[PDB]
CSV table of C-alpha atoms and ligand atoms in Angstrom, one decimal:
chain,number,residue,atom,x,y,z
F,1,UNK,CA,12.9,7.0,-7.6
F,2,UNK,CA,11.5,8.4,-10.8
F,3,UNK,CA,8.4,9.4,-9.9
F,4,UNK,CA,8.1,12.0,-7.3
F,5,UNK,CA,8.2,10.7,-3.2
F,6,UNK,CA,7.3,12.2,0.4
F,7,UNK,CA,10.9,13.2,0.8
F,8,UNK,CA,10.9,15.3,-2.1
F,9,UNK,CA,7.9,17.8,-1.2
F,10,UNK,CA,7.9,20.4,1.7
F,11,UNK,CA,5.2,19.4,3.5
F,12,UNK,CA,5.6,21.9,6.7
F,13,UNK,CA,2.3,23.7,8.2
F,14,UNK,CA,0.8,21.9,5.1
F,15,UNK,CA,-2.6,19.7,5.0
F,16,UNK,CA,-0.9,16.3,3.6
F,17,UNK,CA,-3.6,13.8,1.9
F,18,UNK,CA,-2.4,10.4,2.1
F,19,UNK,CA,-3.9,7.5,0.5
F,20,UNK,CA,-3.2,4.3,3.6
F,21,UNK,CA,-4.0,0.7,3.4
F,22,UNK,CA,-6.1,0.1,6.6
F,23,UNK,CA,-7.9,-2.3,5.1
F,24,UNK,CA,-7.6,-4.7,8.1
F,25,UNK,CA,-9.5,-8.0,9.0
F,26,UNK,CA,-12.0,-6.9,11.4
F,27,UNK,CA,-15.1,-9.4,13.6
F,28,UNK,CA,-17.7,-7.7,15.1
F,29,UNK,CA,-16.0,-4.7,15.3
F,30,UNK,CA,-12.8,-5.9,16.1
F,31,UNK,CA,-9.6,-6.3,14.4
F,32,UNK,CA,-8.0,-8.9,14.4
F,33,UNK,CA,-5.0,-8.3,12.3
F,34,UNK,CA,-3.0,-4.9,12.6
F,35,UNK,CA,-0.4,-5.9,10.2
F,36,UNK,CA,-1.3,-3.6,7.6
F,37,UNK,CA,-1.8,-0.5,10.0
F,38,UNK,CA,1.9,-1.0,11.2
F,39,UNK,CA,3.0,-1.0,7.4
F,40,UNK,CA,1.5,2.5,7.3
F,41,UNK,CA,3.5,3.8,10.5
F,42,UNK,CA,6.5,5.2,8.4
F,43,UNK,CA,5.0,7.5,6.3
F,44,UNK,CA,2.2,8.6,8.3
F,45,UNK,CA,5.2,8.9,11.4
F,46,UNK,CA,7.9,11.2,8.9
F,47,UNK,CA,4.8,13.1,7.8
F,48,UNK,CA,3.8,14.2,11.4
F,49,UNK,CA,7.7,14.7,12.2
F,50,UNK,CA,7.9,16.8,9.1
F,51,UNK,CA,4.8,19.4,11.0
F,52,UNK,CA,2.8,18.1,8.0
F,53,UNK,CA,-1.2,17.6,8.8
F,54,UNK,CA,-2.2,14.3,7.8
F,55,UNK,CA,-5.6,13.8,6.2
F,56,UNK,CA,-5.9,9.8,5.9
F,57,UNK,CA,-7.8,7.7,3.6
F,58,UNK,CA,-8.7,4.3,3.1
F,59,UNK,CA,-10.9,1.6,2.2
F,60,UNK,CA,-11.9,-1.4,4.1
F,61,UNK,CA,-14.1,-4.4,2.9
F,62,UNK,CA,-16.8,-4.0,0.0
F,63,UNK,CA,-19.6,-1.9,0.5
F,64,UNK,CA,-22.5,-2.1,-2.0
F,65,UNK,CA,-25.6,-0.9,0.1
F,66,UNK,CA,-26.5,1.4,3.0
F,67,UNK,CA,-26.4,-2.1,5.2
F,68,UNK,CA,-23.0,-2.9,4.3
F,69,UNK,CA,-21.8,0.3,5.9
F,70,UNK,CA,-22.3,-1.2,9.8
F,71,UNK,CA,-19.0,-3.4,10.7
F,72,UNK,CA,-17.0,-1.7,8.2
F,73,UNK,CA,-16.4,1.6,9.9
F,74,UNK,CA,-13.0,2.8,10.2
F,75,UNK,CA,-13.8,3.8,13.7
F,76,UNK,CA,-11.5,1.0,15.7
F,77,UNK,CA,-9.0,1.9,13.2
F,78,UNK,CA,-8.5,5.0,14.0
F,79,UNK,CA,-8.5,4.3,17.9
F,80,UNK,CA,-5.7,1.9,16.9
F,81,UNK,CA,-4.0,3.6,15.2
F,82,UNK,CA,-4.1,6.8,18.0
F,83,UNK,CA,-2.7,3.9,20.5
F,84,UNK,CA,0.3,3.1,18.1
F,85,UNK,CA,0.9,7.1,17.5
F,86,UNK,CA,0.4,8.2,21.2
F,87,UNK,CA,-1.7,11.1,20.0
F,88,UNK,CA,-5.2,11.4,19.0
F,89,UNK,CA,-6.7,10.9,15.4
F,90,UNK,CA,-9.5,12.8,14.4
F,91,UNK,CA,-12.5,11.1,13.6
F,92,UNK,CA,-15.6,13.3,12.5
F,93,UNK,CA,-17.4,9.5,11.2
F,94,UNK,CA,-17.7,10.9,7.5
F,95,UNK,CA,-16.2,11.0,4.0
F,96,UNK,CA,-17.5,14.6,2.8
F,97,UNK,CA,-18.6,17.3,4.1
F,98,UNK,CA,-18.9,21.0,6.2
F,99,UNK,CA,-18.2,19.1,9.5
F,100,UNK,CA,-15.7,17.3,8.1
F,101,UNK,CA,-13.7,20.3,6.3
F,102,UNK,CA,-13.9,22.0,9.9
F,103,UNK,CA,-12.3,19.7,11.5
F,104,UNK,CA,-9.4,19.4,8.7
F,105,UNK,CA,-8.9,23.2,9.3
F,106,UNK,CA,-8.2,23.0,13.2
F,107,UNK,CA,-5.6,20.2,12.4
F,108,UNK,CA,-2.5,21.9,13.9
F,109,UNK,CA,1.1,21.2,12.8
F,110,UNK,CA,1.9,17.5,13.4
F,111,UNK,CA,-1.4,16.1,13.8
F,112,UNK,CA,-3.7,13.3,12.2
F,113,UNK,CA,-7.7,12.9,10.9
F,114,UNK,CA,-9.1,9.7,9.7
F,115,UNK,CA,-11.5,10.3,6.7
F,116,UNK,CA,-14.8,7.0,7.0
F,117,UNK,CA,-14.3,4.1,4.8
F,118,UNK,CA,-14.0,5.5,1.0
F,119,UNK,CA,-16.0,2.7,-0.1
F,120,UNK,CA,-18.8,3.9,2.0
F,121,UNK,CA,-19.0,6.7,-1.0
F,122,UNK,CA,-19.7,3.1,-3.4
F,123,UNK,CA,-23.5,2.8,-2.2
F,124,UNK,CA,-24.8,5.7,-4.4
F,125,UNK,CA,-23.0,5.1,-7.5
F,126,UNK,CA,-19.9,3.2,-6.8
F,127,UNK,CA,-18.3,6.8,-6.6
F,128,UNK,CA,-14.8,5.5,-5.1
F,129,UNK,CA,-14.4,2.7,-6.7
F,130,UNK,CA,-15.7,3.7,-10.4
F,131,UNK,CA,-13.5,7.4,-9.9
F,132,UNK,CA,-16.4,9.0,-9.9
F,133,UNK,CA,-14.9,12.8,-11.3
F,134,UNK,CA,-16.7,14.9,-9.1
F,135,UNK,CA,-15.6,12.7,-5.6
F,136,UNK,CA,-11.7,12.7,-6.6
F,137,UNK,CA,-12.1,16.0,-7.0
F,138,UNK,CA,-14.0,17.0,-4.1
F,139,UNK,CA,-11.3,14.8,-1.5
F,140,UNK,CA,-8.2,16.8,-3.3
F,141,UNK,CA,-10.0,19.9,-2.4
F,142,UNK,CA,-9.5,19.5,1.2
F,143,UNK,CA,-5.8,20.0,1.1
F,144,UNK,CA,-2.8,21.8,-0.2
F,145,UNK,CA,-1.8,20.2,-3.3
F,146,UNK,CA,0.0,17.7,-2.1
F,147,UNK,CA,-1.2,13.8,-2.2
F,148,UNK,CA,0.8,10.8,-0.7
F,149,UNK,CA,-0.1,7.3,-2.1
F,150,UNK,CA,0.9,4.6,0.3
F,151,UNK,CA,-1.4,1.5,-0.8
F,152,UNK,CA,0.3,-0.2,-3.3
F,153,UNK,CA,-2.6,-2.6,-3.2
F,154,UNK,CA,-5.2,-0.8,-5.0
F,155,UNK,CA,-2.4,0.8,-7.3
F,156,UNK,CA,-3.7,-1.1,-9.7
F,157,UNK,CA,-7.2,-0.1,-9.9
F,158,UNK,CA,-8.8,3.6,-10.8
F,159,UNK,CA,-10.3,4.6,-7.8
F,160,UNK,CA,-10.9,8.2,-6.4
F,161,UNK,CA,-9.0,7.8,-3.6
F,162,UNK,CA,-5.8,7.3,-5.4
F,163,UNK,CA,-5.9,8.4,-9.2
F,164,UNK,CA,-8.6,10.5,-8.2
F,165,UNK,CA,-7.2,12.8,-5.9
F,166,UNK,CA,-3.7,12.5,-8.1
F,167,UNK,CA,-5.7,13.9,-10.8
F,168,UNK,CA,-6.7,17.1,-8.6
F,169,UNK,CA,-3.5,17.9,-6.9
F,170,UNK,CA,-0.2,19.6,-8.2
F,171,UNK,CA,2.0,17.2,-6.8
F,172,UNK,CA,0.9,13.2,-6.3
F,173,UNK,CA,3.8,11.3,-4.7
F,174,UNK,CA,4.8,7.3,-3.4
F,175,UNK,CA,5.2,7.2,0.1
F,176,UNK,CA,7.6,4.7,2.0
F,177,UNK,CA,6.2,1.4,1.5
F,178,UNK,CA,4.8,2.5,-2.3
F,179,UNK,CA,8.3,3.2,-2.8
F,180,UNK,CA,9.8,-0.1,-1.6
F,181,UNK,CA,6.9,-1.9,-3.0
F,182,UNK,CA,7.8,-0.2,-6.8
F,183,UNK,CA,11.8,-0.5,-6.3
F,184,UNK,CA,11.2,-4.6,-5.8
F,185,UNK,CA,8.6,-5.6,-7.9
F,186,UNK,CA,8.7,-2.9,-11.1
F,187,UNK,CA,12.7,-1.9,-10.9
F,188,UNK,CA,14.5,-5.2,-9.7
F,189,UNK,CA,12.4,-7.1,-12.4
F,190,UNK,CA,13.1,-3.9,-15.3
F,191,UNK,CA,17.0,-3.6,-14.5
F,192,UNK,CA,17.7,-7.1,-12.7
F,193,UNK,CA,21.2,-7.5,-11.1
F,194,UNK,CA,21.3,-11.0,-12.6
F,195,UNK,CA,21.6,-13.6,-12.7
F,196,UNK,CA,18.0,-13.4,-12.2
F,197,UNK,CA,16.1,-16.0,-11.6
F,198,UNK,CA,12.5,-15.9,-11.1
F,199,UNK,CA,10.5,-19.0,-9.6
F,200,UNK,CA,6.2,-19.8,-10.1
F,201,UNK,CA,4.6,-21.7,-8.8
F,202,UNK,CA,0.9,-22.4,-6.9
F,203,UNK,CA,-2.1,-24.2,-8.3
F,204,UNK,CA,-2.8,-22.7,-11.8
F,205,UNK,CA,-1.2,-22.2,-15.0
F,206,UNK,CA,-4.3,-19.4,-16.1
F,207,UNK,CA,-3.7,-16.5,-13.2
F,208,UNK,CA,0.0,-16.9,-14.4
F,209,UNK,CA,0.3,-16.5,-18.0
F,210,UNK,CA,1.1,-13.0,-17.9
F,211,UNK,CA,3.9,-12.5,-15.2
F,212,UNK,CA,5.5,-16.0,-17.2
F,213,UNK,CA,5.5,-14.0,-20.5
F,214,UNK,CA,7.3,-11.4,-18.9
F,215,UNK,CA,9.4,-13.0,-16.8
F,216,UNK,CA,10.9,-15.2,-19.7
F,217,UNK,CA,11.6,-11.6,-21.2
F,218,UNK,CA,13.4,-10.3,-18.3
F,219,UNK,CA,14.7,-13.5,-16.7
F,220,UNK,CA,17.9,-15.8,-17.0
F,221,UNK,CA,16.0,-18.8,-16.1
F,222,UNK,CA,12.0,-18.9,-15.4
F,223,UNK,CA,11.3,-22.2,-12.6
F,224,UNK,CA,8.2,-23.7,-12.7
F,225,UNK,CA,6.3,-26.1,-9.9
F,226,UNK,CA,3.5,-26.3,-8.2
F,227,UNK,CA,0.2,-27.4,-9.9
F,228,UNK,CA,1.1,-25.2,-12.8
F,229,UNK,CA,3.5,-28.2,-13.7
F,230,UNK,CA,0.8,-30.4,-14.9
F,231,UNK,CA,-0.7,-28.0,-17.7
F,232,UNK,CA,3.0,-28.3,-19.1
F,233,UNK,CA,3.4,-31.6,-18.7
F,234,UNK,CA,0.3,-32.7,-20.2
F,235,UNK,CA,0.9,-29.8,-22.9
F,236,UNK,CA,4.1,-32.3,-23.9
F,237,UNK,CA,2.4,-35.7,-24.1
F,238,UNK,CA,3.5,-36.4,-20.7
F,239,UNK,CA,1.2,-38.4,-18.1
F,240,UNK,CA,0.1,-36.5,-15.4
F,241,UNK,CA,-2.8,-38.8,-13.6
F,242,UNK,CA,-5.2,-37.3,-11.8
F,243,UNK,CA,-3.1,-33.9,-11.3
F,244,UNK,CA,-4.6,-30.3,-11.3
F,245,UNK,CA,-4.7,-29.6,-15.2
F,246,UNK,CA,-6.2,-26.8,-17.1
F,247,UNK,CA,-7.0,-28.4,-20.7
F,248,UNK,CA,-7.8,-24.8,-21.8
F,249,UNK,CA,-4.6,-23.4,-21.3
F,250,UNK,CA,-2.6,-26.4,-22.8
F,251,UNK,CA,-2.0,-24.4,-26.3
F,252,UNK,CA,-0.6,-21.7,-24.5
F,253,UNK,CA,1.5,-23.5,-22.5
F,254,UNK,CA,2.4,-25.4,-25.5
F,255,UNK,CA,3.6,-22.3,-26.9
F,256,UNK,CA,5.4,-20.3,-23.7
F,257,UNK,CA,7.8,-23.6,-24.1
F,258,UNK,CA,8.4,-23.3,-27.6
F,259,UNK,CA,9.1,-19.4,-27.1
F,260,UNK,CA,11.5,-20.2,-24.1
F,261,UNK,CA,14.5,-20.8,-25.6
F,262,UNK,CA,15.2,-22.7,-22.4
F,263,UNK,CA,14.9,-20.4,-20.4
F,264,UNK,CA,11.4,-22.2,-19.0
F,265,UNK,CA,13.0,-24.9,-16.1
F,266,UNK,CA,10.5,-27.7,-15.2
F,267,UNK,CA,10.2,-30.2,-12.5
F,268,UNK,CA,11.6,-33.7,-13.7
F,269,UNK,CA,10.3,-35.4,-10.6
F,270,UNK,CA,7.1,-35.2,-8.5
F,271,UNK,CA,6.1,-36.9,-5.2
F,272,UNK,CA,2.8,-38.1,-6.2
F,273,UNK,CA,0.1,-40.1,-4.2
F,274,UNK,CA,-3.1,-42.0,-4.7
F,275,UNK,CA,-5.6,-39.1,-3.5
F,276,UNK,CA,-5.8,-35.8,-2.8
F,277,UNK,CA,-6.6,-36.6,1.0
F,278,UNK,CA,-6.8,-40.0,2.3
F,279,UNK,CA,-4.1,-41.6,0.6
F,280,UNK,CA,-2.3,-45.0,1.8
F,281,UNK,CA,0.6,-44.2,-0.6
F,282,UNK,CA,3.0,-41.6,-1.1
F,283,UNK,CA,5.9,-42.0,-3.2
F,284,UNK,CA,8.6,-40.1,-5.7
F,285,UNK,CA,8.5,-40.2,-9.3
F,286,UNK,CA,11.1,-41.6,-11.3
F,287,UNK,CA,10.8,-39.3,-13.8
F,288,UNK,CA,8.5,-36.4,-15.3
F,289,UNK,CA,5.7,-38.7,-15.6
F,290,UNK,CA,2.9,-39.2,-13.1
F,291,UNK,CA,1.7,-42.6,-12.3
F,292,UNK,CA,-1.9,-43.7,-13.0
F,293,UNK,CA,-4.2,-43.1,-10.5
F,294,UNK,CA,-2.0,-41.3,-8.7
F,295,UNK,CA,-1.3,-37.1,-8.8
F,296,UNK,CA,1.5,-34.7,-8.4
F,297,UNK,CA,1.6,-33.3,-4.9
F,298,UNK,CA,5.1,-31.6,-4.9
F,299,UNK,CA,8.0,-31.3,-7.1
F,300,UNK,CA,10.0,-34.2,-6.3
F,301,UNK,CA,14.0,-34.3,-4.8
F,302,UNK,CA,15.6,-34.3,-7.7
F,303,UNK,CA,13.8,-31.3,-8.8
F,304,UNK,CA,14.6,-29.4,-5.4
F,305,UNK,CA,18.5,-30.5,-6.9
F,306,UNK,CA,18.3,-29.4,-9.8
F,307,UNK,CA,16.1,-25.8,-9.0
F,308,UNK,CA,19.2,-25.6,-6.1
F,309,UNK,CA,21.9,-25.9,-8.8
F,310,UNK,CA,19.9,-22.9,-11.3
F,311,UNK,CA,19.9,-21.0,-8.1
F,312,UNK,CA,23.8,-20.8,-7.6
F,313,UNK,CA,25.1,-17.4,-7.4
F,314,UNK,CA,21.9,-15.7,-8.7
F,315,UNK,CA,21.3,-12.0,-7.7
F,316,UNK,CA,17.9,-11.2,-7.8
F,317,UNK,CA,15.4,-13.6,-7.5
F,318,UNK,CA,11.1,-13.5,-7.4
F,319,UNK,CA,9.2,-16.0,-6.2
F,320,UNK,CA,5.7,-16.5,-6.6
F,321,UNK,CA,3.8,-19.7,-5.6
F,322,UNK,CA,4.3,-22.8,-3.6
F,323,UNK,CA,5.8,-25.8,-5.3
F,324,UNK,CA,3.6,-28.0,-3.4
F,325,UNK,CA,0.6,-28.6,-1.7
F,326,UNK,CA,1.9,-26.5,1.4
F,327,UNK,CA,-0.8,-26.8,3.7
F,328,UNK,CA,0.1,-30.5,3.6
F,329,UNK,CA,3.3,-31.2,5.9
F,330,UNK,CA,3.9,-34.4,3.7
F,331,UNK,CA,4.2,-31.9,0.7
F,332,UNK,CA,6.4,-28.9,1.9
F,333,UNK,CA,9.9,-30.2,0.9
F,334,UNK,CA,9.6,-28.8,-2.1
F,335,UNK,CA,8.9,-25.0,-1.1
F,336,UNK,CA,11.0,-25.7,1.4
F,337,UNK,CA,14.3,-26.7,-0.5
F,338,UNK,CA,13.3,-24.0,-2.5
F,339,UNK,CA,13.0,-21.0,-0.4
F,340,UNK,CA,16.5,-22.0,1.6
F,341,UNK,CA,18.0,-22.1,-2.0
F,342,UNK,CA,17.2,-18.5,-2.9
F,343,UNK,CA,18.2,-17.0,0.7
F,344,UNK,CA,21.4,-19.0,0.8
F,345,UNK,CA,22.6,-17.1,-2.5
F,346,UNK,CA,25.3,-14.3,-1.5
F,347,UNK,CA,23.9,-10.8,-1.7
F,348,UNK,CA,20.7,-12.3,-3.5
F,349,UNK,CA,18.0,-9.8,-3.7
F,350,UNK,CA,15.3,-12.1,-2.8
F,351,UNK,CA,11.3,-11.1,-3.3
F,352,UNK,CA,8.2,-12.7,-2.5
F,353,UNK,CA,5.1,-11.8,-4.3
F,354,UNK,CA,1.9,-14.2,-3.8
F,355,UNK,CA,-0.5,-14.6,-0.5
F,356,UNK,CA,0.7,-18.7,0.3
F,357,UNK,CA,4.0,-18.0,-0.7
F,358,UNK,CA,4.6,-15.3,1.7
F,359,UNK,CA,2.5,-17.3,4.3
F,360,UNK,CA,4.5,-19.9,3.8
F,361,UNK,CA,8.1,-18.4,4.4
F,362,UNK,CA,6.6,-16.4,7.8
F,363,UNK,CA,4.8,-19.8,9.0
F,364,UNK,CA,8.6,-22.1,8.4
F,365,UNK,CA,10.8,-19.8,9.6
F,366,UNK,CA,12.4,-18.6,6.4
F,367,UNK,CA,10.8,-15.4,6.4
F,368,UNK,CA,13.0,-12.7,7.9
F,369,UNK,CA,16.0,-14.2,5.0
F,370,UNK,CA,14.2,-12.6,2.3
F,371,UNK,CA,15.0,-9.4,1.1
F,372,UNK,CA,11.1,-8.1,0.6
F,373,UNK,CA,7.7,-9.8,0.9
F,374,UNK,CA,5.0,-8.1,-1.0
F,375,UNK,CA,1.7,-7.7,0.1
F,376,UNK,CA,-0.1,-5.8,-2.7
F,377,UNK,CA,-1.5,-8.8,-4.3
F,378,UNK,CA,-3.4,-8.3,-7.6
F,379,UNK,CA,-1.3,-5.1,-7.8
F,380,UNK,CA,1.9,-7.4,-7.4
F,381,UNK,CA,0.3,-9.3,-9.9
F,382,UNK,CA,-0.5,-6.9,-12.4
F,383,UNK,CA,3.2,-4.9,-11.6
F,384,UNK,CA,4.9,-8.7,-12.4
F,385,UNK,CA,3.3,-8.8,-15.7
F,386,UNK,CA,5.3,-5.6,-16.3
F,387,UNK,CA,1.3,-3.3,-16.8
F,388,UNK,CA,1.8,0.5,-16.3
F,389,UNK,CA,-0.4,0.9,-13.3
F,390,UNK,CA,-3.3,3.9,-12.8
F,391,UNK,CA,-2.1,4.6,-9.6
F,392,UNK,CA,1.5,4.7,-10.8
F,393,UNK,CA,0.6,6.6,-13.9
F,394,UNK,CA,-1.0,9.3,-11.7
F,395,UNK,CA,2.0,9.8,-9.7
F,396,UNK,CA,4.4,12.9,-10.7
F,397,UNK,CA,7.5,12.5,-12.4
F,398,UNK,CA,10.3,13.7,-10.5
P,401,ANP,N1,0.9,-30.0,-7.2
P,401,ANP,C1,-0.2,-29.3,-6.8
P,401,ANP,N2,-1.4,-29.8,-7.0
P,401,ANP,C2,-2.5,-29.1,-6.5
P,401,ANP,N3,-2.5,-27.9,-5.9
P,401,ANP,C3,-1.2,-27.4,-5.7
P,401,ANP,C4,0.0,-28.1,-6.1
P,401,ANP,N4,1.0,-27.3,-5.7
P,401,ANP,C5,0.5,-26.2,-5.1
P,401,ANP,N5,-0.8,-26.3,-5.1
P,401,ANP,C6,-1.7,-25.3,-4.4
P,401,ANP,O1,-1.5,-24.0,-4.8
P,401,ANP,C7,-2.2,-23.1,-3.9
P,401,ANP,C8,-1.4,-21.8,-3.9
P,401,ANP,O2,-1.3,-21.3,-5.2
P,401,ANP,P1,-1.3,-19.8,-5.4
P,401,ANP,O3,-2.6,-19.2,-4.8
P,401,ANP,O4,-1.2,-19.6,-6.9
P,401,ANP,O5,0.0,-19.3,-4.6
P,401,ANP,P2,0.1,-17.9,-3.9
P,401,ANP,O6,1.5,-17.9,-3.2
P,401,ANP,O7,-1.1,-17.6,-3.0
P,401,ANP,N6,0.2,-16.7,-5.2
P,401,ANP,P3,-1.1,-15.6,-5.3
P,401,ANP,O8,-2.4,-16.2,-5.2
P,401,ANP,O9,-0.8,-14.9,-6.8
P,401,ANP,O10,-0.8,-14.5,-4.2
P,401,ANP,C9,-2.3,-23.9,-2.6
P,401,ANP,O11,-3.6,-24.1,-2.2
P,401,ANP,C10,-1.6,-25.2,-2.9
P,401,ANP,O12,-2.2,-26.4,-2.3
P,402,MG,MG1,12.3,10.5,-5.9
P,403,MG,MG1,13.1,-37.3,-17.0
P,404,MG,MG1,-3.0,-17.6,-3.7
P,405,MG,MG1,9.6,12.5,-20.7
């Protein structure tokens, strides 16, 4: 990597502050989804094997008044965490202060303190989330100028737990999932092995705009499906019935065609029926056009040919968005034939970067075929439309 990463810093009898993403799901107290805490075993595991002390950090939910502080503790968290390590993690139950500077002191070679939710700092001030100066400054303090940032999904926003700290420390490195996280989404987009081929999808032509303009930069071929279809379609002259359309964005879309140089790759076939939910018929398009009365539910077969046939022998490949309504078994063929058509390509680099998409691929059995799912969201986003990122920024240069 470029910037600076945990391998590259002696981090030995050392007080190591790394930013995590424990951000889990939690009911009354309970969570219900560890996913995100076994993403941060790898880093948090080489820095304890290293004799490293790990200071941890992390947000979890929103927390705008005193009230919002109870449920969102990172108490359970830390006892799970201690169950997945076999060894304790400290947890003094603040984010500042004597006690909790004590307790980072007796931290021996090798072992592991959880810092409260960083967002409880947000009630007076919105400290954490706004950077407030004096808070990023304040956390670096604790340790030995060293910062690990593991939570690619805040990357993209200035907070003082990530640029922060960064800001206050001599060396500010990407830990292991950071690292894969950058090496799929900024460097196999920036220096494709091609041909690459990136596919978009989902509802909405609007939270899109962006990642297409740069994709049609750094692309071979740019598909399109999902709802996003219609706002080109209509863009064109071409009916679209009752189909998810943004008449806003039609201009635009109007002009990424025009700009594509045919690179842009649209569906020429839906399977459209006569209501959202409740219909009594289903059928396939002949052709672009979508019959009155009727909408656009999935991109049709010989779409799923034709978006087979781009995807022959392509190298590196980023999908975003379903190409359907997915929830709907009648309309999954499309995201279907699409997602076997990228893993079927020989030594494809294959990357998944939106929340239904990657939902999608786990729920069908495609999943484990793909080279890397991404789970940093509006980072991902914001990465994919090819923005230099705070929390990137803030990381050292090797
Ligand atoms: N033809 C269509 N008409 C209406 N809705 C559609 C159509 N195709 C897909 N969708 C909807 O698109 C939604 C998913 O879009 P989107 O949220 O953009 O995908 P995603 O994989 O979650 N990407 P992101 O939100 O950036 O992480 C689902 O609710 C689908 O039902
Ligand atoms: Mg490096
Ligand atoms: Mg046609
Ligand atoms: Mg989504
Ligand atoms: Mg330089």
């Amino acid at each position: 990597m470029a910037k600076l990463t945990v391998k590259d810093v002696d981090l030995k009898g050392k007080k190591v502050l790394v930013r995590v993403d424990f951000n889990v799901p939690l009911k009354d107290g309970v969570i219900t989804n560890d996913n995100r805490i076994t993403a941060a075993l790898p880093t948090i595991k080489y820095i304890i094997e290293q004799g490293g002390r790990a200071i941890l950090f992390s947000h979890l939910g929103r927390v705008k008044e005193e009230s919002d502080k109870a449920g969102k503790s990172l108490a359970p968290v830390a006892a799970d965490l201690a169950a997945k390590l076999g060894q304790d993690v400290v947890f003094p139950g603040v984010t500042r202060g004597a006690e909790l500077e004590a307790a980072i002191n007796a931290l021996e070679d090798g072992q592991v303190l959880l810092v409260e939710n960083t967002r409880y700092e947000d009630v007076d001030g919105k400290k954490e989330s706004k950077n407030d100066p004096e808070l990023g400054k304040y956390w670096a303090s604790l340790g030995d100028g060293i910062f690990v940032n593991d939570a690619f999904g805040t990357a993209h926003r200035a907070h003082a737990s990530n640029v922060g700290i960064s800001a206050n420390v001599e060396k500010a490195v990407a830990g292991f999932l950071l690292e894969n996280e950058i090496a799929y989404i900024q460097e196999a987009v920036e220096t494709p092995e091609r041909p690459f081929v990136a596919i978009l999808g989902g509802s909405k032509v609007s939270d899109k705009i962006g990642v297409i303009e740069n994709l049609l930069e750094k692309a071979d071929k740019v598909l399109i499906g999902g709802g996003m279809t219609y706002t080109f379609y209509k863009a064109q002259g071409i009916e679209i019935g009752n189909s998810l359309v943004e008449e806003d964005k039609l201009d635009v879309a109007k002009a990424l065609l025009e700009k594509a140089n045919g690179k842009l790759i649209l569906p020429v076939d839906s399977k459209e029926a006569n209501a959202f939910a409740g219909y009594t018929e289903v059928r396939d398009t002949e052709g672009e056009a979508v019959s009155e009365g009727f909408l656009g539910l999935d991109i049709g077969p010989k779409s799923i040919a034709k978006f087979d046939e781009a995807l022959t022998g392509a190298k590196t490949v980023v999908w975003n968005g379903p190409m359907g309504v997915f929830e709907n078994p009648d309309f999954q063929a499309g995201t279907i034939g699409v997602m076997d058509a990228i893993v079927k390509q020989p030594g494809v680099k294959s990357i998944i970067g939106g929340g239904d998409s990657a939902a999608a691929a786990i729920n069908l059995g495609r999943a484990d075929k793909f080279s890397w799912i991404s789970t940093g969201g509006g980072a991902s986003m914001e990465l994919l439309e090819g923005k230099v990122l705070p929390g990137l920024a803030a990381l050292t240069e090797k």
